[model samples]
Target: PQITLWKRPLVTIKIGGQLKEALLDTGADDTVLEEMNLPGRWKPKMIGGIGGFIKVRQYDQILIEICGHKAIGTVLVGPTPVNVIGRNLLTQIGCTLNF
Candidate 1:
């Protein structure tokens, strides 16, 4: 299926069996989410984006579903202004640019 890009492509996603809204950001290389409780040992990471840098908990092997497509990958838990689905997850969902 083709994903329509908005000013920010917002989509519903399930992570760790919890449902949440996220922004689809092709410019990003990895997924980043608002702070959440995840049952796993997450390593520390520093991420810099349009909003500058933030310290995050890098949760590995997270199961996520985007638009009914399931994928297992890493999700960064941090002080992100909003949850974001990056190219890493987008690639799994077979997303492509229309323009």
Candidate 2:
């Protein structure tokens, strides 16, 4: 059997004050923000999702504009391998993936 793959458009965001371009994944359940070079204090919170629950320490809010739509939300602060914008938001916009 052949596996089908679906690709979603991703935007690059700058983390902290260093302005590093990080790839934003829309399929992600929560936003993962980078921690290096952060300038202010961050508050940690417990967030639940498909993966059960995880502690999220956020320092800043990221303004993301995708598909001509803009959204602002708290960003998880840490050394994230990649930033993910998951189904929590996408489902609201009526986005569906075809396999």
Candidate 3:
């Protein structure tokens, strides 16, 4: 679907079969969501953002649905300003920046 740049590009996504909203952030290299408990083993990882960096739990091979499109990838669980859907999953969903 086509989107405009007038405001934050937010969309509904399903992770772990739960529904959540996330920002389609092209600037973000990895998808990071707010702290939530997921059923899976994860690894500790440090990620950076505009404010600073924080440690996150990296869960792999997770199935996610973005605006009804499904994809399997890694999702980072931790404290963030907001849930962000980054390039990692964006590419999987075939999201592209347009003028």
Candidate 4:
């Protein structure tokens, strides 16, 4: 017998006191936070980017809820502007992206 996998729907989550609809991307190895939408407490840490080393931040933990599922965990704050639901959150609930 073999198990089957199904893609789940994207959900809206509130981060930094704002609601954002993000796609669930299981292919991502880690959770990512949009630099523009990060909370005040998160501190930026300089690190490398696609081109070279750049300033990056890591949030210790954040309140996030999606499709009735919720959890708090560290996330990488990227310099670029993009909302993504990475593997950290998806693996917790065994979900795959639908779109």
Q: Local distance difference test, per candidate?
A: 0.89, 0.54, 0.91, 0.64
Q: What's the lDDT of the predicted structure labeled candidate 1?
A: 0.89
- Residues 2-93, candidate 2, lDDT per residue (tens digit)? 22344435454443323444443445766665555455677877655565766668755555554544556656765455556556445544
Q: Is candidate 1 or candidate 3 better by lDDT?
A: 3
The whole-model C-alpha lDDT of candidate 3 against the native structure comes to: 0.91
* Candidate that would win on lDDT: 3
Candidate 4 achieves a global lDDT of: 0.64
Task: Itemize residue pairs with steric clashes in candidate 4.
Answer: 45-56, 47-54, 48-53
Q: What is the lDDT of residue 26 in candidate 1?
A: 83
- Residue-level lDDT tens digits of model 1 in 1-99: 666654667889999878999988888899999989999698999999776799999988888999999888889999888898988889998888877
- Report the lDDT tens digits of candidate 4 across residue range 53-90: 54657787777786668866766777645556778777
For candidate 3, give the lDDT of residue 50: 70
lDDT of 3 by residue, 1-72 (tens): 899988989899999868999999999898999998999799999998677899899999989999989888
Cα distance off (Å), candidate 3, residue 17: 1.7
Candidate 2 residue-wise lDDT at 74 = 59
TM-score of 3: 0.96
TM-score of each: 0.92, 0.50, 0.96, 0.63
Error of 4 at 27 (Å): 1.4
User: What TM-score would you give candidate 2 relative to the actual structure?
Assistant: 0.50
